[PDB]
Amino acid sequence: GVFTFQDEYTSTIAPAKLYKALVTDADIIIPKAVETIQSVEIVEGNGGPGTIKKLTFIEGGESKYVLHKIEAIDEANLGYNYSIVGGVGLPDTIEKISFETKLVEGANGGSIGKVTIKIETKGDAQPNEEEGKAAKARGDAFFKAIESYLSAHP
Ligand SMILES: O=C(Nc1ccccc1)Nc1ccccc1
Ligand SMILES: O=C(Nc1ccccc1)Nc1ccccc1
Ligand SMILES: O=C(Nc1ccccc1)Nc1ccccc1
Ligand SMILES: O=C(Nc1ccccc1)Nc1ccccc1
Ligand code: NA
Ligand code: NA
């Protein structure tokens, strides 16, 4: 069975610019903007659906990574769907996790990043409350880091 979550992230950057930083130019901007992320490798595909990116980052002294597979990409509508097909975002505890994301206009010309998360867990375990909280904080940090970078580097 499926566990579904909906979260919202806010940025002062305009949706079309954010989208371009986090999708179109992600493999350049993410590592430059986010001090905790060291690299983005494209391992498969051509930036469309099917594309797999490897993001490597630091957390707790540890170098970790995640594999991001692009599920759908609707640039016209500022949409981008992905799943974690490996690394540390797909632990032994999680069978499948995907994200459906949309960037929409927020307050004062900024953005709201709308994220729908679907999770399937291994065994009868529900998604880990603690790790969900940690993941939201990491998400916030990330979007904020992107925002600081793009505020200074338009
Ligand atoms: O790549 C990421 N996001 C994104 C957002 C909008 C459009 C396309 C992609 N996010 C990401 C967030 C945290 C860790 C790793 C990746
Ligand atoms: O924080 C996130 N923001 C975001 C960015 C672009 C488009 C939509 C949302 N996503 C996120 C979700 C889960 C884990 C990590 C990052
Ligand atoms: O575990 C979660 N996210 C994650 C994303 C990328 C890498 C590592 C972890 N999210 C989560 C979302 C809702 C409830 C609980 C957890
Ligand atoms: O880990 C962080 N971002 C990230 C990058 C790729 C995949 C998942 C998350 N940020 C971070 C935030 C606070 C403390 C440590 C790291
Ligand atoms: Na970096
Ligand atoms: Na389960």
**What is the C-alpha to C-alpha distance for residues 6 and 119, in angstroms, rounded to an integer?**
12
For ligand 1, mutation pick of 9, 29, 30, 35 (most atoms within 8 Å of CB): 30
CA–centroid distance, residue 35 to ligand 5 (Å):
4
What was the experiment behind these coordinates? X-ray
Q: Which residues contact 92 (CB under 8 A, 6 or more apart)?
A: 122
| Ligand 1 pocket residue status of 67, Cβ below 6 Å | no
CA–centroid distance, residue 113 to ligand 1 (Å):
10
| Six-digit token string for 35 | 């001090």
Place of tokens 């905790």: 36
CA–centroid distance, residue 63 to ligand 6 (Å):
28
Architecture of domain 1-154: 2-Layer Sandwich (3.30)
Resolution of the PDB structure in angstroms: 2.0
Residues paired with 55 in a beta bridge:
40, 66
Domain residue spans of the chain: 1-154
CA–centroid distance, residue 37 to ligand 5 (Å):
4
Length of the chain: 154
Q: Residue 30's closest CA among 117, 150, 127?
A: 150
H/E/C letters for each residue in 80-103?
EEEEEEEECCCCCCEEEEEEEEEE
Q: Give the number of the ligand closest to the Cα of residue 35.
A: 5
Task: Give the DSSP H or E segment for 58.
Answer: strand 52-59
Q: Residue 45, by phi and psi: left (phi above 0), alpha (psi -120 to 50) or beta?
A: left
Which atom of ligand 3 has the smallest separation from the CA of 99? 5
Place of tokens 């880091």: 145
| Ligand 2 pocket residue status of 99, Cβ below 6 Å | yes
Amino acid at position 52, single letter: I
| Six-digit token string for 100 | 């459906």
